[PDB]
Design a protein around this motif. Structure first.
Motif, mmCIF file in Angstrom:
data_model
loop_
_atom_site.group_PDB
_atom_site.id
_atom_site.type_symbol
_atom_site.label_atom_id
_atom_site.label_comp_id
_atom_site.label_asym_id
_atom_site.label_seq_id
_atom_site.Cartn_x
_atom_site.Cartn_y
_atom_site.Cartn_z
ATOM 1 N N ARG B 286 0.816 -1.227 0.000
ATOM 2 C CA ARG B 286 0.000 0.000 0.000
ATOM 3 C C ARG B 286 0.848 1.276 0.000
ATOM 4 O O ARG B 286 0.662 2.129 -0.865
ATOM 5 N N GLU B 290 2.513 3.420 -3.588
ATOM 6 C CA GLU B 290 2.202 4.852 -3.554
ATOM 7 C C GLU B 290 3.478 5.700 -3.665
ATOM 8 O O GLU B 290 3.517 6.667 -4.435
ATOM 9 N N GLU B 312 -1.189 -1.272 -11.629
ATOM 10 C CA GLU B 312 -2.388 -0.711 -10.995
ATOM 11 C C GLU B 312 -3.566 -1.669 -11.216
ATOM 12 O O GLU B 312 -4.284 -2.008 -10.276
ATOM 13 N N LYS B 316 -5.846 -3.941 -8.462
ATOM 14 C CA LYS B 316 -7.300 -3.766 -8.452
ATOM 15 C C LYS B 316 -8.073 -5.095 -8.414
ATOM 16 O O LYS B 316 -9.124 -5.173 -7.775
ATOM 17 N N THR C 28 -10.088 9.887 5.494
ATOM 18 C CA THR C 28 -9.859 10.593 4.229
ATOM 19 C C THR C 28 -10.858 11.749 4.104
ATOM 20 O O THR C 28 -11.888 11.741 4.773
ATOM 21 N N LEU C 30 -12.664 12.357 1.460
ATOM 22 C CA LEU C 30 -13.848 11.759 0.824
ATOM 23 C C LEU C 30 -14.775 11.127 1.884
ATOM 24 O O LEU C 30 -15.975 11.399 1.882
ATOM 25 N N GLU D 291 -7.566 9.223 -3.122
ATOM 26 C CA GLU D 291 -8.708 8.834 -2.309
ATOM 27 C C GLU D 291 -9.745 8.013 -3.061
ATOM 28 O O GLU D 291 -10.301 7.078 -2.487
ATOM 29 N N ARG D 293 -9.217 6.068 -5.656
ATOM 30 C CA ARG D 293 -8.548 4.796 -5.883
ATOM 31 C C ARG D 293 -8.598 3.919 -4.628
ATOM 32 O O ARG D 293 -8.990 2.758 -4.708
ATOM 33 N N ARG D 294 -8.259 4.490 -3.472
ATOM 34 C CA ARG D 294 -8.243 3.769 -2.207
ATOM 35 C C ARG D 294 -9.641 3.356 -1.750
ATOM 36 O O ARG D 294 -9.806 2.274 -1.179
ATOM 37 N N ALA D 295 -10.649 4.210 -1.990
ATOM 38 C CA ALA D 295 -12.012 3.930 -1.544
ATOM 39 C C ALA D 295 -12.755 2.950 -2.442
ATOM 40 O O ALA D 295 -13.663 2.281 -1.973
#
Ligand SMILES: Nc1ccc(S(=O)(=O)N2CCN(S(=O)(=O)c3ccc(O)c(O)c3)CC2)cc1
Ligand SMILES: Nc1ccc(S(=O)(=O)N2CCN(S(=O)(=O)c3ccc(O)c(O)c3)CC2)cc1
Ligand SMILES: O=P(O)(O)OC[C@H]1O[C@](O)(COP(=O)(O)O)[C@@H](O)[C@@H]1O
Ligand SMILES: O=P(O)(O)OC[C@H]1O[C@](O)(COP(=O)(O)O)[C@@H](O)[C@@H]1O
Ligand SMILES: O=P(O)(O)OC[C@H]1O[C@](O)(COP(=O)(O)O)[C@@H](O)[C@@H]1O
Ligand SMILES: O=P(O)(O)OC[C@H]1O[C@](O)(COP(=O)(O)O)[C@@H](O)[C@@H]1O
Ligand SMILES: O=C([O-])C(=O)[O-]
Ligand SMILES: O=C([O-])C(=O)[O-]
Ligand SMILES: O=C([O-])C(=O)[O-]
Ligand SMILES: O=C([O-])C(=O)[O-]
Ligand SMILES: [K+]
Ligand SMILES: [K+]
Ligand SMILES: [K+]
Ligand SMILES: [K+]
Ligand SMILES: [Mg+2]
Ligand SMILES: [Mg+2]
Ligand SMILES: [Mg+2]
Ligand SMILES: [Mg+2]
Lengths: 422, 425, 436, 425
Positions: B286, B290, B312, B316, C28, C30, D291, D293-295
């Motif tokens: 993670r 990044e 990427e 996913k 975050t 968001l 964000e 991407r992570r969520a």
């Protein structure tokens, strides 16, 4: 010049990858060594003259291994350690307390063995500071050790040794009732696959750091030094990585107990620890420790985070804290400040025990008392400054953070002050 | 779809953590590794590991690169070691499940002010015997690398030069050395005598970080499992050292006296294999992905652009593998630099590129020898299916899995620009 | 959950559902947005000051009393219109309304008086009318000057010179109203006490579609510098004739607070409109909702990381105090201040805790309204013989006044910020106190 | 070049913190990208003329809203015919033709508990007249959406349902409403009377955040440029409101009285266009992409996997556009959810999908009219070239730019799985 030393270019990096890229072998460490060294006492390190050299080399905690030797043998080792330690008491501004830890034989094929009950009784009678409890498998093992120490051993710290699969699986319940943990890699590496020990070490260090409780990395750290004057490349790496993992203490067993180079082994751990401490990436470490530490209404906990934040803001050389039990210094240590935590205490036992917490430098206060409590507090703070100047922690012009309380007695720390030196 | 059992293995709970501290707290000794071992093992050949029968056991234990130390032994001695390695490797050509390329690396004696007469002759021997890699001793500056490159002559320009950093000057001039080298070796033996022993870990961590940033292979070497020269099991510091070299970001780990002259050469290789697999699962992808993504500059090179898109995409869908077609190994190297958890299965017709890509972490080479199809799109499809069928046979892939496939728009090296998501049938 | 579990058991789940605390704990931005809740009621006192322009709709003493009760903190006198006699009467009426609540610190609310200049017009610098108006300001004891059309550092030096030796304590807030002011922003901010984003003229001097960029940039730079910034003009424009504002107007007020503005302003809405009191009440209601919706987790982290390392003990104590306040969900930070500076340095870190500033200076008590989250308490008692006792009495005055005003409750933790010797510039102490 | 990195707020885009991003915003840094936030204009007496509608299309109107709270079916049929006549007047130049969606906004339930009888008749009218979208008034629960869907019948399955959240119950039951809707409208007019006016911004920001997390379109509506109904220029609060709706994450912004009855309908559309372009350049993609991407959850759907890989590739090379082929609009929607800076140029044969994709931020629909080529690979290539030629004519692309091309492995919807890096020639 200031910003080129102690890996400060790597410390200012925006990512851990950039931090690694900026590490510099020519950037010399300046701060005092924060990770305590535990040295096991034995035939190679038992004489008073040898113990004096080990104290000068950096030994902070003397470990007595009760798996071997009689009570008479261990009482003589204790007397020799105390004689060597007290030989330096004539200089109050530089005196170094040394803790005495009793490492139990263990349960063998049995809970608490009858030999452990007798050895723990011996420990209380001889005033040991810490117990390293062997083969702790569950919370009731810690309760049994605590009961065996009796009412006279209430102040002794219990460090549970995790040495097998059960200890790892029941880690959370063991840590909850212990004062700290020892990653006892010798037995752990035989009880679980050798290739999994690093995972158990890293997990236990991370959980102890989260809990704010001391964690010791132990066994075979500089093993080849039992017969050779210099360690292997894997051994220096192991010591540095234990510090970078977050260990409060590092240990020597056969290296100091029976080896041919006990003093050199202590000097090597000191040299590596200082280099590794400067290479710590405080930018991310402090952020994570701060975020993970729960919200609290305890004034000592609240003052501790405020003081560490203030220290980082001004590049404080030290945080001077007054402590009776060591607790106020432990709560500052849990945030891993770059500033040394100079703990001023009247308790000889607390001064020895705080060596378990990374970055705490205990100063035993033996100056005459002041009639006015506020004046007595100020004098203890000035003693911390004068001892800090003599030892190289502080210089005129430095900023220090001072942590005190509103009334006498333990549990009332609630004040943080910003002070300019001299 | 995948199940709770899937998410409990390969340290997946620690992988999903929001902070590095929580990642450490979630590491589990009962969470078993599932992925193939990605960090290559370099074993030094000597009296303890020279026989064909011993070399077969070392290949089975996990040896990917055979190191020939030219500090000792004649050209005749080393030619016999090379012949024995090739005989042991080719003994598995009858079984697709067991055959694996093994690179041959020549480690020079070293310098004198620059390139020694003996090194010129040994480098010439390397070219004549078709070695894949040179580990150049005591590299102190960029001109030392240029001299090694010149000594590789008209026939050996494809040989990879891994510069060994062994002294203070090599560390201080690291950036100029890395710029002209194919990769680096942290030669801790001499480094630990040239600089204070307590500073070697700083040089190791810095060089690994800079090589990871540059996307070039880095080897951690010397005394990793030293006690295993005489003992059947290593010390607690030695297992820690191997795991931490992988966690630092090393592409390869090495064995010297442990395999060249020790009493347990096969056991030393087995121990590095076991530790590397555990450490690779404990990597905190993670933050690593990044940071590699953020530090890598913007690029208009389609191979670089395709590589980051593919890595990427693999994260996913928890892709079992990224299958890449490569002639030089470059497209596989650019995927490897982003440290995907998915295995990078590199299908190539070049036997040399197949051996050399062992330098890049997580690249599993597959040498393809079928005659070329008249229709290029059919030849590409046959090679992608060869990677899939090899992956099924070896345990990387099952029907229903997702794989990422990386190819280019036309034949020849340098045109990688396509990433596809395939469902395994 | 583990980071708030013990405090959730102690303070209760109801506490952690209010003041957008679920959105505040998000990992975050968001997730912070996804957790914003219209049923999560604000609890804290309103921290963004309201500047109301005085005119025919808000000049009477009785009307001014209602505006003070509604939340007006700063009264703006627009010197573009009206004579010196007209403005002197407005000042006298404001002071009469303010002093009608002076019988107790429970009812007293200091109100600053700001003089907004006519400007240079077609001239290159300080106009003759501005020289006379600035001299009127000094003679009538105004607290702040909103200097119109500031284009460069020398414009603020000219305003400062026109205030004379007796007006050294007056705060100069430079109004940025044109392209030159935006381009020379850094040199202007350096010599000013703060900035006003004067959107009316700015929206005619530069393309209307670019004003939001200038507003967000200037607020960000002022937040980085730790200097007050005011958002002004047409915030609730339709409220000049209507009892309720448009959807764009409520959004504009909320977004000015979320951008980081220390103050928000009303012009025609209070000077000439039909609902001056209702306009102040509407800015108060929106600002309280928007303040609770601030994402302190990232804001504090970025302010902390962007602020350079400091060896100033007031600055060092301020960050330690704000960190301590966040750790315990402190109700308030009580600070002793002579000039307002120690309270301003706490305000720059945007604590959720109210900054209760205890001062003997009536002028500093009025001026600190420029800094977000600072609540002035004017201390009137003569000095105690022993300085340490005088300091303790002032801290206890803050505690008692705070309890009696609902800011503090028994069981709350308060952070107290004091210094080691008398006089301005020596703040260096942070204390954690439990309210009994 | 340095000129490239000074435009479109690129200095603010490279900042390491949001605070530094704000400090670097520059009024002299001109926007370069095409405007990505769609504009919905309400049709009325001020905007019904075919000639006036042509000017509104040129100004930037993407969706025409028919408010069924006023006017008869005969009135709305004439509005539809006038919009279609104006839109089709540009069909003679296929490289510049702009699709325009038609949305039917229902009167609502009134004092009733669910779907009113007038709404049943209006929804039937919508299906018979081929409307693309329904803006369903006063949606309070999931069963309200099901009733709208049932009223559209079997012939209206392709119509998008955007639920209008206008009261406290709609906000509290938001998650269940979003789950069954195609998207949401923050209907601030009624919302600002149903809940305290000072709380509307919290409901707007929450709903936009949740729609962005779900990857579903969200519209900000009502009084955005209200004063432009009578005045030629908007207030400072109005320009701020439009910019902040874009910065919040709205896919669409709307005009009601400003275009239906006011004196400046064309100027109101031009003002929303100008503000939206400035605000889109001020978006802090560094944190936003990280964000999103992570969520976004892990996925085994190849379209979803290809979309994230394509957006990552586009950011790596500063791609001018992502050209995607789509039948239903879904592949373009999945790219849009990651908020790429690169324009998503969506090439489709479906006239309805071309109109509907205006709901997704950053999607530029191109209607392809040519009949299918005999060789499917050539038909795919011709559509990609049509995207490039349209992009060049419209100013999206220039020779030398890099583009990411997203296609699938077979004809028909649901098979997107390929991403390709292409240099514009
Ligand atoms: N508890 C704790 C917290 C932080 C640290 S740390 O030293 O800052 N640090 C440890 C290493 N990790 S890391 O994410 O594993 C990592 C390793 C190598 C890389 O090149 C990289 O980009 C990231 C990043 C965090 C160490 C311990
Ligand atoms: N979903 C989504 C994700 C990110 C963004 S953002 O524009 O990057 N976003 C804007 C809001 N902020 S913020 O944390 O509210 C903030 C505001 C002002 C500051 O000066 C500051 O230091 C922090 C966080 C970053 C916007 C929307
Ligand atoms: O760290 P501990 O054990 O809580 O001790 C901290 C205590 O030390 C003090 O600073 C000084 O107390 P004493 O004068 O009793 O030594 C107290 O104010 C405070 O409560
Ligand atoms: O990694 P490299 O050496 O650039 O090779 C990648 C090349 O492999 C291919 O995928 C297949 O090419 P070949 O058919 O020539 O083997 C090319 O399209 C691409 O350019
Ligand atoms: O915020 P300022 O203007 O620096 O004032 C802070 C000062 O107030 C005090 O707390 C009290 O000072 P006084 O007794 O002079 O009012 C000082 O110790 C400190 O220096
Ligand atoms: O976005 P959607 O609706 O899934 O459409 C994507 C589809 O478009 C294509 O790219 C082209 O398909 P068609 O030739 O049928 O138009 C397919 O390969 C892919 O499945
Ligand atoms: O008991 C110990 O110390 C061990 O086993 O490592
Ligand atoms: O040459 C080597 O490998 C060394 O010195 O470590
Ligand atoms: O002067 C002002 O207040 C303006 O222009 O907004
Ligand atoms: O219905 C609407 O559009 C509203 O209420 O905003
Ligand atoms: K023992
Ligand atoms: K050699
Ligand atoms: K004025
Ligand atoms: K309607
Ligand atoms: Mg043991
Ligand atoms: Mg060497
Ligand atoms: Mg103006
Ligand atoms: Mg409505």
């Amino acid at each position: 010049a200031f910003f080129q030393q102690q890996q400060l270019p790597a410390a200012m990096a925006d990512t851990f990858l950039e931090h690694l890229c900026l590490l510099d072998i020519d950037s010399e460490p300046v701060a005092a060594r924060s990770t305590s060294i535990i040295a096991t006492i034995g035939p190679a390190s038992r004489s008073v003259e040898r113990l004096k050299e080990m104290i000068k080399a950096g030994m902070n905690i003397a470990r007595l291994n009760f798996s071997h030797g009689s009570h008479e043998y261990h009482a003589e080792s204790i007397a020799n350690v105390r004689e060597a330690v007290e030989s330096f008491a004539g200089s109050p501004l530089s005196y170094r307390p040394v803790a005495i830890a009793l490492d139990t034989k263990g349960p063998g094929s049995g809970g608490l063995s009858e030999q452990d009950v007798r050895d723990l009784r011996f420990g209380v009678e001889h005033g040991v500071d810490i117990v390293f409890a062997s083969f702790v498998r569950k919370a009731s093992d810690v309760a049994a050790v605590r009961a065996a120490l009796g009412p006279e051993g209430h102040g002794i710290k219990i460090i549970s040794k995790i040495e097998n699969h059960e200890g790892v699986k029941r880690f959370d319940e063991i840590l909850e009732v212990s004062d700290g943990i020892m990653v006892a890699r010798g037995d752990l590496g035989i009880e679980i696959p050798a290739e999994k020990v690093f995972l158990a070490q890293k997990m236990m260090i991370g959980r102890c750091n989260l809990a704010g409780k001391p964690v010791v990395c132990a066994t075979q750290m500089l093993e080849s030094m039992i017969t050779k004057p210099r360690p292997t490349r894997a051994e220096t790496s192991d010591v540095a990585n234990a510090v970078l993992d977050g260990a409060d203490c590092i240990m020597l067993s056969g290296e100091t107990a029976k080896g041919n180079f006990p003093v050199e082994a202590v000097k090597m751990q000191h040299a590596i620890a200082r280099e590794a401490e400067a290479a710590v990436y405080h930018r991310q470490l402090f952020e994570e420790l701060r975020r993970a530490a729960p919200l609290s209404r305890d004034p000592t906990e609240v003052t501790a985070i405020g003081a560490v934040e203030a220290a980082f803001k001004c590049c404080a050389a030290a945080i001077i804290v007054l402590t009776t039990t060591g607790r106020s210094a432990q709560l500052l240590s849990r945030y891993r400040p770059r500033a040394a935590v100079i703990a001023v205490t009247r308790s000889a036992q607390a001064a020895r025990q705080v060596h378990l917490c990374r970055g705490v430098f205990p100063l035993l206060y033996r100056e005459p008392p002041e009639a006015i409590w506020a004046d007595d507090v100020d004098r203890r703070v000035q003693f911390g400054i004068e001892s800090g100047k003599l030892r190289g922690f502080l210089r005129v012009g430095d900023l220090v953070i001072v942590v005190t309380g509103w009334r006498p007695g333990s549990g009332y720390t609630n004040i943080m002050r910003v002070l300019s030196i001299s």
